[PDB]
């Protein structure tokens, strides 16, 4: 029963910050690679951050450099986005999503999402 | 009795069939393991066939997605040569999801890695007895062979390689006597790749083609001594060995040869006889289909695409995979030459069939001095079996 | 001593709803020596729930039993005409008790 | 050459894998024994499994209701290290419900105890001949470690109990020489309870913890020399061992601790070494599900909650059981120390999974004085099977 | 084939005494445990009399102290249950049932019952 | 080392299990072969069972209709003590419907009886080398005792039937040295009805108890020597031993006791203890159902109908079969007396209940002086199985 | 494929002689028992003849004796029965049916029977 669980959705003023959670069960963060990923209201997707099976934090999107941190613990496979200075440019659904790198053929492609969590940013 | 040293390999014309499993055509009503990167050793009384095993039988619901090489419940296990490696024929080994293991005469020396990605660990066995553990220093994927180790006046010799798979990464030499770690050597490569390399004793050193994973399409070569003293180089010849790869043209034997396809690689071979070499390669320049054995003359001096002779093993409508190197020596034959003998993998299922496992089989041929043959000895399973459906 | 009631007296449903029976100690157990058993009119007793969560072999899915402490629940999830009995909680840690039971009829 | 004595425990830092069986992953379409209690036993040449059958094969009609433990079909049966189960695989030893067994250097001692309820009766062999028989003394179920003995100088020591299982029971040292008991000691040890003793060579004489499972939280110890003269206490950290158990807290080594969640328990261990104290347990409080290993150097004289590292085996999503304590001799390896071993038993069905049947596998780990590594090594068969549904 | 099949129910005037048998099929009684319930009429059910697998009567209700005696025969595969002096307030139905216990986890449950029999007290 | 003679029996108590196959347990989902008849023989090594296999598999559609004995298909094959007959585990033997085997110490000698009802063969090898054959002499079935011959002083004994059922019958005795035979001798009982006797070593004689399927419902017993001289007579006891049988009361040792049961009857046996005699029997006087052994202190010189201690094997509910006997010798055991053993076959399947099959499984004991227990290990499989729907 | 096929039937004058046989297939005559049994006009099965499978005739039946000699042939698996002095009384239909005889148990039963073959006695 491999599934991910997301939390920490909701609205924000202008300028504040946020801390969104997603949890997994069924398997390890040891072995698998981890993403965020976002959908715009009435927009395609977009791919927000991408981490290793080693810790490493190999990419971050433009919009998002600077002011998001992609973070994960092993001990409680949890993964968390903190976000900071929010802009009304940020109202969307997030998705953590995985997929796998083989030393043999590589790089399968994401094949479980969660289901996703709502924030939005106003007055 | 010790497998001694100085003895040179020994004059061949042809290559000869050794063995077959037939081991996915019998996992079909049969039980049978998924196992995958299955190689050949030999010791002073026996010649045996290690694998790596998934954890599962063959159609089973277990074997759903087993494309997959790291995870907990990989095992090597070893079987004699030429049988199905059944739950009933098999002897447990270790517990890894890379590994290599030799003989030095009388005994069994294995090398076993296993644990998280970043902090993997490798632990030696002698005999079934724990001796020895190595721990990863680079914290990264540390990989090894995945075929025999060489082990001469009772002193085993192997190669490991640590960090990226597309960039620099870092090998050492691990020197070895009855089990436990006597010294090691840092390898000062730059602009090399070396991976899963392929390691046959000549002369008083040990020779060892290995793979590029990063931007070459020839084979990267390395030769050592019991000093751990080093060279270094790539196959000279302009007939390619690995897969993918370009059209025959010009080679070099001081760097990378890119061509546009030197991304990703397979596992490999080639003999060295003084200025000629023995070419293991595919017959398709995109998939892994077919095999032949090319005889090159010049292949190790010269730059030129012309050879002298070519033998076929599976042609070029069947599955192929890797292929590896092993020896058997004067101390079981009774000569004063070293027989060199090769093994290929043959892989059925995923990423290129409609299953939901991946599993494959061997073949294994010697070198002889005498009248031989070319034919084809594919794999022959009719998939998909019933648990597909 | 654990004096067991078992509530509500009577129990009226349609066939196609969800039901829970609560069970209810004086004094706290100290184990989970809880069971449930089930008694239809003309039938010795049939077990259905053991150690007050683990069930008994060959018994339909929508039963199942939960609690803890002083205070215990059975439920069924999707009732169907042929489940109307008498339920009954029993304990047989220490000491040995039966409840008084609950009855279940049609609407 | 027999086990000597003298010799003391190995300086370790940490565990290294051993082996691993994935029985029930291939019993799914294999055919595997239904088993339970598995433990290991090492000689001077090999390594086996013993384990407890209840008659039936795994995926059967016949493997109904098999939660339940002692009936006239359960066998003790063994077979190699790290191999599944097959009835093609397995060596009978004895007829029982409760068992033990080990190894004198050349040769090895079986008992086993089976019969009624209350005039049970135990049968010891040497080799496959019957030699000696015990009966019941207490008139109620009479159990033994269901775990390796001791066998060193030609002597082998094993503990046996009798009485209630939440009482005052009654505890004998038995003292056999290849086959027949040559002496027994009555142990008194009022407000005690010992059960499933795991027991390993230290210096001169044995070691042993147990299990309470009338009121304690943490572990009781016997220690005893050949003249059968015996110590006896409890742990004394604060980092409690059973399963249940409460929070850390204070903990005391003259009498048990209770606090609430005495009652019932698991087969566990513990190994000493000089003032510290390597502590095997499970992950949750109120469950069987995870293991991890705690080094406490202060842990044999002191009572505080503090510790100084902790290394994982299995994380805290799946089950565990019953874990036990083997070593292995300078007579096999060769050195002046004895190595440390262990291994875990994992446990499917009910009463916690919706079946009709329960088996258990099992990880084997040994320990070494080197570079070690913390992951999970999980059981991952799917459940539930055909015959449940 | 478990099964269980209890005999000796009928009408006794007050004062006078019973012996009730359970017989049994497809086990031995040398590993089981044993019990006589009762259920009185228009009542719930009444625990009467527990005996081990090895012979100890662990427990009798207060109500039947003093005057009831359980007691059974393992070659016959037998359970037997005298009773003497009786009231108006025994009149009932009687069943022998079976449960067990674990040496590791313990004491399961009742999961096997016999049929019943009757026994009415009156003039 | 060959087995010496002049050594007794061994003083005894009681008996403690030895071993169980739980054969048809395990059949229902694996490869085991359809059995009966299966005896146990022990050598200076190794204790093995010897069987009689209908050529089938069980659960299968070869296994219809095998409750026939003669056919061209049955053979005889052994495998270790305890374990399923499967295909994976036995040896082959002999070819044969009728067979024996013993041992010498270092080897083994079978008999084996195959060809039509009219001149059948008797083929006789001794390590799987033919040395000696041979061939009826009256014209009608001929027949061996099913369990074990005695070989001391490198020469072995038989004892083999030909002639009718119910009627007059004849008798040979048999001494073979190293496979080969090297006398025989007519035994002239007129009267008497000797058939699948089983025999045991004492003092320097050989002692058999056999079955009487014309008028007896006791036992009829021979004794002899190196010279072939013998002795004979009945079991002397009022407690009879023959299935079926009539209510105990007096007995006789010089002919049948009838009293309207005497027809038909099992393979059984008895051992003497000087004036004592135990008697292998089972429970109900009609069918094959239960088992006990009984001690009769004045059995072989007196025909009244007392004991001194029954001991209980199986109980009255479940189905047993035939019972042989056995020994262990001094060589093996290291001591001055022979260890007396006893098999119990357990039948399954037709004519009794509602299958297309019989098979059996075993079950197996040893005398000890020491406290043992009564019990019952019956068979405890759930038929019918799936072929039979 | 079991199965027997009798021939030899017809119509034969008073005094005269037949024989009539019995072709088996599947097995062999060398392990099992043969038997002759008929039935009359209008009437139920008599047994006639029966021959051991070590070749023995172990019985015939008082109304056909002296006059019918049973005899069988195992190189080409058949059996005969040759009668001689035909009365008017023997008008009937015959079968060959086979038993066998085990040496733990003992004779079952007449479990194959063949299709029968007619003859009549008349003028
Ligand atoms: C294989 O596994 C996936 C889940 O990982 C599941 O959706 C699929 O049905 C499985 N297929 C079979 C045939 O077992
Ligand atoms: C398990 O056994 C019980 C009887 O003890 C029976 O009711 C149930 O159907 C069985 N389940 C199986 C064989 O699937
Ligand atoms: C057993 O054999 C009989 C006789 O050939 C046949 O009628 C029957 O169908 C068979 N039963 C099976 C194979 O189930
Ligand atoms: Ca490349
Ligand atoms: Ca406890
Ligand atoms: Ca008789």
Same mark, same amino acid.
């Given at each position: 029963?491999?599934q991910?669980?997301?939390?920490?959705?909701?609205?924000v003023?202008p300028?504040?910050?946020l801390?969104?959670?997603?949890?997994?069960?069924?398997?390890?963060?040891?072995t698998?690679?981890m993403?965020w990923?976002?959908?715009?209201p009435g927009?395609?997707?977009?791919?927000?951050?991408?981490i290793?099976?080693?810790?490493?934090?190999?990419?971050?999107?433009?919009?998002?450099?600077?002011?998001?941190?992609?973070?994960?613990?092993?001990?409680?496979?949890?993964?968390?986005?903190?976000?900071?200075?929010?802009?009304?440019?940020?109202?969307?659904v997030?998705?953590?999503?995985?997929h796998?790198?083989?030393?043999?053929?590589?790089?399968?492609?994401?094949?479980?999402?969660?289901?996703?969590?709502?924030?939005?940013?106003?007055? | 009795?010790?497998?001694?040293?100085?003895?040179?390999?020994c004059?061949?014309?042809?290559?000869?069939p050794?063995?077959?499993?037939?081991?996915?055509?019998?996992?079909?009503?049969?039980?049978?393991?998924?196992?995958?990167?299955p190689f050949?050793?030999?010791?002073?009384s026996?010649?045996?066939?290690?694998?790596?095993?998934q954890?599962?039988?063959?159609?089973?619901?277990?074997?759903?997605?087993?494309?997959?090489?790291?995870?907990?419940?990989?095992?090597?296990?070893?079987?004699?040569?030429?049988?199905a490696?059944?739950?009933?024929?098999?002897?447990?080994?270790?517990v890894?999801?890379?590994?290599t293991?030799?003989?030095?005469?009388?005994?069994?020396?294995?090398?076993?890695?296993?644990?998280?990605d970043?902090?993997?660990?490798?632990?030696?066995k002698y005999?079934?007895?724990?001796?020895?553990t190595?721990?990863?220093?680079?914290?990264?994927?540390?990989?090894?062979?995945?075929?025999?180790?060489?082990?001469?006046?009772?002193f085993?010799?192997?190669?490991?390689?640590?960090?990226?798979?597309?960039?620099q990464?870092?090998?050492?030499?691990?020197?070895?006597?009855?089990?436990?770690?006597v010294?090691?050597?840092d390898?000062?490569?730059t602009?090399?790749?070396?991976?899963?390399?392929?390691?046959?004793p000549?002369?008083?050193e040990?020779?060892c083609?290995?793979?590029?994973?990063?931007?070459?399409?020839?084979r990267?070569?390395?030769?050592?001594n019991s000093?751990?003293?080093?060279?270094?180089?790539?196959?000279?010849?302009?007939?390619?060995?690995?897969?993918?790869?370009?059209?025959?043209?010009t080679?070099?034997c001081?760097?990378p040869?890119?061509?546009?396809?030197?991304?990703?690689?397979?596992?490999?071979?080639?003999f060295?006889?003084?200025?000629?070499?023995?070419?293991?390669?595919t017959?398709?320049?995109?998939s892994?289909?077919?095999?032949?054995?090319?005889?090159?003359?010049?292949?190790?001096?010269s730059?030129?695409?012309?050879?002298?002779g070519?033998?076929?093993?599976?042609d070029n409508?069947n599955?192929?995979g890797?292929?590896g190197?092993?020896?058997?020596?004067?101390?079981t034959?009774?000569?004063?030459?070293?027989?060199?003998?090769?093994?290929?993998?043959?892989?059925?299922?995923?990423?290129?069939?409609?299953?939901?496992?991946?599993?494959?089989?061997?073949?294994?041929?010697?070198?002889?001095?005498?009248?031989?043959?070319?034919?084809?000895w594919?794999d022959?399973?009719?998939?998909?079996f019933?648990?597909d459906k | 001593?654990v004096?067991?009631? $078992? %509530? *509500?007296?009577? /129990?009226?449903?349609?066939?196609?709803? &969800? @039901?829970?029976?609560?069970?209810?100690?004086?004094?706290?157990?100290?184990?989970?020596?809880?069971?449930?058993?089930?008694?239809?009119?003309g $039938? %010795? *007793?049939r077990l /259905?729930?053991?150690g007050?969560?683990? &069930? @008994?072999?060959?018994?339909?899915?929508?039963?199942?039993?939960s609690?803890?402490?002083?205070?215990?629940?059975?439920?069924?999830?999707?009732?169907?005409?042929?489940?109307?009995?008498?339920?009954y909680?029993?304990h047989?840690?220490?000491?040995?008790?039966?409840?008084?039971?609950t009855k279940?009829?049609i609407?």
């Open positions: 029963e491999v991910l669980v997301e939390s920490g959705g909701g609205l003023q300028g504040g910050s801390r969104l959670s997603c949890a997994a069960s069924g398997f390890s963060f040891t698998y690679e993403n990923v976002r959908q715009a927009k395609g997707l977009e791919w927000v951050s991408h290793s099976s080693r810790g490493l934090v190999i990419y971050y999107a433009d919009s998002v450099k600077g002011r998001f941190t992609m973070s994960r613990d092993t001990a409680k496979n949890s993964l968390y986005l903190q976000m900071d200075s929010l802009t009304v440019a940020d109202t969307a997030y998705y953590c999503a995985r796998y790198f083989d030393r043999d053929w590589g790089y399968s492609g994401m094949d479980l999402w969660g289901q996703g969590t709502t924030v939005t940013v106003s007055s | 009795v010790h497998y001694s040293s100085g003895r040179d390999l004059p061949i014309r042809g290559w000869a050794l063995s077959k499993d037939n081991g996915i055509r019998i996992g079909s009503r049969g039980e049978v393991f998924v196992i995958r990167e050949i050793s030999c010791s002073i026996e010649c045996r066939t290690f694998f790596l095993t954890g599962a039988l063959l159609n089973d619901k277990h074997s759903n997605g087993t494309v997959k090489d790291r995870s907990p419940f990989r095992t090597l296990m070893s079987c004699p040569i030429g049988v490696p059944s739950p009933s024929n098999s002897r447990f080994e270790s890894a999801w890379s590994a293991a030799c003989s030095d005469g009388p005994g069994w020396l294995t090398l076993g890695i296993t644990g998280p970043s902090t993997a660990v490798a632990v030696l005999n079934g007895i724990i001796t020895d190595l721990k990863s220093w680079k914290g990264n994927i540390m990989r090894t062979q995945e075929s025999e180790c060489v082990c001469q006046d009772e085993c010799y192997t190669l490991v390689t640590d960090g990226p798979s597309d960039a990464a870092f090998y050492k030499i691990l020197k070895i006597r009855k089990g436990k770690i010294s090691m050597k390898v000062d490569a602009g090399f790749h070396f991976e899963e390399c392929s390691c046959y000549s002369g008083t040990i020779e083609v290995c793979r590029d994973n990063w931007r070459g399409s020839n990267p070569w390395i030769r050592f000093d751990l003293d080093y060279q270094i180089g790539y196959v000279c010849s302009g007939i390619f060995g690995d897969n993918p790869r370009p059209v025959d043209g080679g070099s001081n760097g040869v890119n061509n546009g396809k030197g991304r990703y690689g397979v596992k490999g071979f080639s060295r006889y003084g200025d000629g070499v023995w070419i293991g390669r017959k398709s320049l995109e892994r289909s077919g095999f032949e054995m090319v005889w090159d003359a010049n292949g190790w001096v730059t030129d695409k012309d050879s002298n070519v033998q076929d093993i599976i409508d599955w192929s890797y292929s190197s092993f020896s058997i020596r004067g101390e034959t009774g000569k004063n030459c070293t027989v060199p003998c090769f093994w290929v993998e043959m892989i059925r299922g995923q990423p290129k069939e409609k299953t939901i496992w991946t599993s494959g089989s061997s073949i294994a041929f010697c070198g002889v001095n005498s009248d031989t043959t070319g034919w084809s594919p022959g399973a009719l998939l998909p019933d648990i | 001593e004096v067991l009631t $078992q %509530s *509500p007296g009577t /129990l009226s449903l349609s066939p196609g709803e &969800r @039901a829970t029976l609560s069970c209810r100690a004086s004094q706290s157990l100290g184990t989970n020596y809880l069971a449930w058993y089930q008694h239809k009119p $039938q %010795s *007793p /259905l729930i053991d007050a969560s683990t &069930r @008994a072999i060959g018994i339909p899915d929508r039963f199942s039993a609690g803890s402490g002083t205070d215990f629940t059975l439920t069924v999830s999707r009732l169907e005409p042929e489940d109307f009995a008498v339920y909680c029993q047989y840690g220490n000491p040995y008790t039966f409840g008084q039971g279940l009829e609407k």
